[PDB]
Amino acid sequence: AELAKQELEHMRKRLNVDMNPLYEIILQWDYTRNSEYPDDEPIGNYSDVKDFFNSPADYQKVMKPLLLLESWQGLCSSRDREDYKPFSIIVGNRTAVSDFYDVYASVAKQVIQDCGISESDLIVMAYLPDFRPDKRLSSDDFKKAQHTCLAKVRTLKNTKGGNVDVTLRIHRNHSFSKFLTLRSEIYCVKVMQMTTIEREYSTLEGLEYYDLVGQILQAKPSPPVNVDAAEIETVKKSYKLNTSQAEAIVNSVSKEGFSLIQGPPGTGKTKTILGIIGYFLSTKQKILICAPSNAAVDEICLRLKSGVYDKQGHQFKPQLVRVGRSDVVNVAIKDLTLEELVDKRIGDEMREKNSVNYRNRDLDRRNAQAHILAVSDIICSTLSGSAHDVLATMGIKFDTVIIDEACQCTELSSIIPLRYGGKRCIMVGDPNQLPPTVLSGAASNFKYNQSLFVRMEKNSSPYLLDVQYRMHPSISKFPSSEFYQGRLKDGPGMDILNKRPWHQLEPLAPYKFFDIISGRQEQNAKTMSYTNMEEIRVAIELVDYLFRKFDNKIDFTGKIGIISPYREQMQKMRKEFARYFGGMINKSIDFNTIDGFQGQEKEIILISCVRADDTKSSVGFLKDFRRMNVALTRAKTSIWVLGHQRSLAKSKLWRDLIEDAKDRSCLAYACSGFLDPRNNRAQSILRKFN
RNA sequence: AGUCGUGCGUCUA
């Protein structure tokens, strides 16, 4: 019918968005340029993310500059932080494609294999006649190179002699093409991969044809639909969920469109997702789960492998498909990956026969993967991975799209999976958690860091999960009072936690705040990261005391986690712990940054604050409330907060936290050798500070 | 203001 034809055309347009404008915009940039913005255009062009968008054209106009700025910042970060291995190529004939030049170059297979150049990688090319052959070429030369040109890899054709033909796409108007003479050596170095940027741009362009385009532009969730309480109670009993969680799931499923579920950490977010999936399956309807990071996808796959109960209580295990590489995905998820499933399902005359056999094998693999995708019910992947070419070729509509950590991903990433005719979308995320990853502070200033879920929450209040179990009630007290503004209720196990010990002792309590009377932090110019020795010494002393108290009674294998805002501080702590304790720190203690440590929960969490000097009133990342909430919510039983008293007291949120700790008598002055009575200096300092 | 998630492909003479 006409409607079917229109839907097919819209799907084809969404899945076949041309990338030429993106290439034209990107290639005009100068690699050697060192500025906060790709060009020198007036700042007025950039605009903050509007809450309401009049039409798709305005939304695209607002978003495109932000995407370009983010891409430029990522390019600069790759140029500076990372130094890819340079290589050299020989220029060939040039083809004048529409507003582009495609250059064919011959390169060695070993060189590209070592560098790691794929068909969707961006490179920067330069001509260095004075470059000595023996000189160690590096990204510094490219940055300081007089002439540079951005190029995009198009095709990689292998040919006898180990010769790879590479088609590089460059901007036609770029002057560097005058140096692209036949049989000319050009030094090229990789910059970054454009696959994610290309997918985001395609989604931005195709948002017009999206079914939920109106809802996204308005950002208004569909009105709640009343449901019978008896059905909610029956679902809760069948799935063994909580009353609030069951009500939220029922309300989200009943209404068609975007659904907002605010799950604070420890509120069974994975359990809530499992319940939603089971309820939807009980009521083929493919469901696409997308998560910002591969770790979340792996966790969801592991949880699903155990099976999901239905309303009747009969556990079942729908075929789950993981769209991801084996190396990036967890080892346990290797079996669930598409490649392994296809392999399991499958189980010059000679030259021609070998070629025919290879083609037949490729066709069989394509057929097997297509069949698996068609029969699969649950497809778990990442936001960027949801737009994989295989899925686009399949063109199978996904009625239900679940988004995890909606507050940890950008709007474009969240909308990417919706391209496959997504009529029902369920986004779950906690705004108090870490904001979506952003490389540019300027982009954040334009509200680019703000995600779609944030606007949806502003328009309408999501269904906050009040009940939490893993988090200790004392730990969740202050976040509930301030971060969540209440609406949090402790679970039945308020004080019946299995890890009872190391709590009765006065020195060790569920929540503590051991400030440092004196502490000096040194900043490294190369990394611009502060490092303090007092925090490291205090943490080492506390860990040693804890181990001595329970060296043999209880094993701390994967139960102690030290987190600091700064990467350099965490690395220094890991090095010191390895030097002092030895190899036992590999498993007993886990060292990682607060942002990196997100998603991991441990019995004991040591939150070490590096900001100690009071000379500068600036607070830094500690000022943000979301980071503090993430740091505090990752603990279960014991929290050890380390940081200078005055520096933290400068901030309003930290001042309130210190006041609450004083009210709860959780403040205890600490310094070097706090638990070392032999060192009389520490005791004297503590007495004087009193 | 000092840190970070995301992507790629495995047989070719």
Numbering used by the authors: 1095 to 1377, 1403 to 1466, 1534 to 1876
Sentences from the paper on this structure:
Here we analyze the mechanism of polyadenylation-independent Pol II termination mediated by the yeast Sen1 helicase. Cryo-electron microscopy structures of two pretermination intermediates show that Sen1 binds to Pol II and uses its adenosine triphosphatase activity to pull on exiting RNA in the 5′ direction. This is predicted to push Pol II forward, induce an unstable hypertranslocated state and destabilize the transcription bubble, thereby facilitating termination. Sen1 belongs to the ancient SF1b superfamily of helicases.
The Sen1-containing region of the map was improved using focused 3D classification and masked refinement, resulting in a local map at 3.3-Å resolution. The Sen1 structure features an ATPase domain with two ‘RecA lobes’ (lobes 1 and 2) and additional brace, stalk, β-barrel and prong modules. The structure of the pre-TC also shows that Sen1 binds the RNA transcript, burying up to 13 nt (register −35 to −23 relative to the Pol II active site) within its substrate-binding channel. Sen1 contacts RNA not only with its ATPase lobes 1 and 2 but also with its β-barrel, stalk and prong modules. The structure is consistent with prior work showing that a 30-nt nascent RNA is minimally required for Sen1-dependent termination.
